[PDB]
């Protein structure tokens, strides 16, 4: 249907053009036309603060007689349940309160959090769940709804509100935190931007109208800053006392009313809403320009406009701490009690240092302290939440494990370690040891053919080393989902299919500027691409995604690096053929069109046939034919072709049984050191101790 008014704004037309759903198209038009007539946004607002400007009202070894009780609001997303459990263990005290909001799209994490809320009476989860996208206006809705709920919980007499993510960690003990806040229980802790205020409004987009819908922040046009109030902002991590939270929730004065309307259509609203209300409210004289946090900002790495697909704006993110940053947690300039961000899949060592420094070492003999396990697929979420690539390869890993079981037993009689696969994988874990990726752990079901009984197993598969080499080059890798801020591939295993667009990365050490040549070679020695790159004298990482026509020929690809025709190093990566299409066994007409190389005979318009003889890469006419025969195969023939390629690039390190087994050489998973069923006390949550702590 047509809109209620003529829509001529360039930005709004662009959003209507890109919006997918009918529901979202109408909400865009309605908001635009309401703003067109000037009855959506307030233009003047009352200020209730008696101060002409701001406040900024500026030891913890004493024992308070009336210690404050804290309400921790944890807004979490992702897969890092075990790291979250570890931080929860570090901040837990029986006298505090914990209200956990789990992103609507993180169901695995929500199931793990429910097990926590059931063990402890002072831990609850929000029954409502939002899809909190970066910068989305739904984050302020999340905070404001949680404050209303918390104020109505009569049995929870809390004095402070603290918000935390799964990437935060305490840098001081709970006892010191309670002592400090008990001494300043009438103060609100908020950190401002600390730069020019006019530029702050422009960089944040406060003068722009945004609308959240279909998990996207659409930019609709311009708007005026309301007159009569002072707009401030900064970090959206704060500490607010119950008095001020009560005012924000229940006040109907001109300031709170018009700000809730203004900030319903605001990008990053939690980064300026609470600042602005407090500064212009009767509580303005309580603000401390310090949020008691250390945020690891490194804008030379974290400002890459990496959310352009979620919001109609650019943005920045803090970096993850590394072990060399431990000294920063010992400064005494200003008081600080929390820090972010931490990520166990990026660097766990610094987390261990921080935790043992606060609460002491674990006893000698404690297992798992240098290990990390992260679940990347759980059966209740369904195979349709996986892709055809990950589903194909997880099945292959499981079969690789069963083949290890059969070959591990040596006997002339019947083999009691012979299995037949059943169904789909039950779960998949990433496995790290001392900040070094070890591979995948696949839990799967199978029938033991000797006794004819079903068993559950977990298999450990690890990728074979492929990088082969006084230059500056330190490492070379091919992958997808390159993280420019943390300089790593988020597709950890390098799982690739024919329709994927690989990326070549190189890592360099200090040295003078040089230029190198990169060569991409497909499984039958066809050169796909060639280009030179200047390695700046300061460059540490380089990467590039060549434009290759799809589908990619399946098999083992090779990337080579030369310096004026002098070979330097090389790496390999696997483009795997797929056994599933839409989660169903692939049909001959589909396998044919997908596994026979790119439509155009070559990968790019430019050809490089002149380089095959120079690089000693002849093209055997027999391989090309066999590759054509492999492209039409299905079923068993295709399963044997895939498993052959996987076996050449992956190793089944071990396999264990979760319950009773008939295979006499199979370990019990709980008795191994690598299984996700083995003890991991640092992330396990037991009974509350006499001191009220879990750690």
């Amino acid at each position: 249907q047509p809109p209620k008014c003529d829509i001529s704004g360039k930005e709004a037309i662009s959003a209507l053009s890109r919006a997918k759903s009918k529901h979202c198209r109408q909400e865009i038009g309605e908001t635009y036309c309401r703003h067109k007539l000037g009855l959506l946004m307030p233009e003047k607002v009352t200020r209730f603060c008696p101060l002409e400007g701001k406040a900024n009202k500026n030891s913890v070894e004493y024992m308070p007689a009336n210690p404050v009780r804290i309400a921790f609001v944890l807004v979490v997303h992702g897969r890092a349940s075990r790291q979250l459990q570890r931080m929860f263990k570090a901040i837990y005290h029986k006298d505090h309160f914990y209200y956990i909001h789990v992103d609507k799209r993180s169901n695995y994490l929500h199931r793990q959090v429910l097990q926590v809320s059931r063990q402890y009476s002072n831990v609850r989860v929000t029954p409502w769940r939002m899809a909190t996208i970066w910068g989305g206006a739904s984050l302020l809705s999340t905070y404001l709804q949680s404050m209303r709920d918390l104020l109505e919980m009569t049995d929870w007499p809390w004095d402070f509100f603290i918000n935390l993510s799964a990437a935060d960690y305490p840098i001081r003990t709970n006892d010191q935190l309670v002592a400090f806040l008990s001494r300043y229980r009438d103060m609100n802790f908020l950190k401002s931007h600390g730069r020019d205020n006019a530029r702050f409004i422009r960089k944040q987009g406060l003068d722009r109208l945004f609308l959240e819908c279909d998990a996207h922040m659409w930019r609709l046009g311009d708007r005026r800053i309301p007159e009569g109030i002072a707009v401030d902002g900064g970090s959206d991590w704060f500490l607010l006392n119950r008095r001020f939270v009560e005012y924000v929730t229940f006040s109907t004065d001109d300031l709170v009313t018009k700000m809730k309307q203004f900030y319903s259509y605001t990008l990053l609203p939690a980064e300026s809403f609470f600042h602005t209300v407090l500064e212009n409210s009767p509580h303005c004289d309580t603000m401390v320009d310090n949020n008691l946090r250390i945020t690891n900002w490194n804008r030379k790495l974290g400002c890459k406009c990496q959310y352009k697909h979620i919001v109609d704006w650019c943005g920045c993110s803090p970096n993850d701490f590394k072990p060399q940053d431990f000294h920063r947690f010992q400064q005494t300039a200003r008081p600080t009690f929390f820090a972010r961000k931490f990520e166990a899949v990026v660097n766990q060592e610094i987390i261990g240092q921080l935790d043992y420094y606060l609460y002491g070492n674990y006893p000698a003999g404690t297992p798992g302290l240098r290990s990390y396990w992260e679940n990347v697929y759980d059966e209740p979420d369904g195979i349709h939440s996986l892709s055809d690539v990950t589903l194909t390869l997880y099945h292959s890993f499981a079969r690789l494990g069963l083949r290890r079981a059969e070959t591990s037993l040596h006997t002339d009689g019947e083999n009691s370690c012979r299995y037949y696969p059943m169904g789909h994988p039950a779960s998949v874990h990433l496995y790290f040891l001392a900040d070094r990726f070890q591979g995948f752990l696949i839990k799967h079901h199978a029938t033991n053919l000797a006794v004819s009984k079903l068993e559950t197993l977990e298999t450990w598969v690890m990728p074979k080393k492929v990088f082969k080499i006084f230059g500056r080059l330190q490492f070379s890798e091919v992958g997808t989902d390159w993280d420019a801020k943390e300089r790593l591939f988020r597709n950890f295993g390098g799982l690739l299919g024919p329709m994927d667009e690989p990326v070549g990365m190189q890592k360099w050490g200090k040295g003078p500027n040089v230029t190198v040549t990169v060569i991409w070679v497909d499984p039958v020695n066809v050169i796909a691409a060639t280009y030179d790159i200047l390695i700046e004298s300061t460059a540490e990482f380089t990467h590039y995604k060549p434009p290759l026509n799809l589908p990619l020929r399946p098999g083992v690809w090779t990337v080579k690096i030369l310096h004026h025709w002098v070979p330097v190093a090389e790496t390999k990566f696997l483009v795997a053929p797929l056994t599933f299409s839409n989660r169903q066994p692939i049909k001959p007409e589909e396998a044919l069109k997908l596994h026979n190389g790119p439509l155009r005979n070559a990968y790019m318009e430019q050809s490089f046939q002149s380089l095959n003889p120079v690089l000693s890469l002849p093209i055997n006419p027999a391989q090309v034919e066999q590759a054509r025969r492999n492209a039409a195969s299905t079923g068993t023939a295709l399963e044997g072709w895939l498993d052959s390629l996987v076996g050449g690039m992956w190793t089944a390190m071990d396999i264990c049984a979760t319950g009773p087994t008939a295979c006499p050489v199979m370990q019990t998973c709980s008795q191994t050191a690598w299984s996700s069923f083995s003890p991991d006390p640092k992330s396990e949550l037991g009974a509350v101790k006499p001191d009220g702590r879990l750690r």
């Binding site: 910068g135 950190k191 401002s192 931007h193 600390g194 730069r195 702050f200 422009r202 960089k203 944040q204 987009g205 902002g233 900064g234 970090s235 959206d236 990008l267 990053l268 980064e271 945020t295 900002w297 400002c303 406009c305 704006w313 650019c314 943005g315 920045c316 993110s317």
Partner: peptide
């Protein structure tokens, strides 16, 4: 260190 996660356009 400065605060604010927004960069223009």
């Amino acid at each position: 260190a400065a605060e604010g996660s927004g960069e223009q356009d």
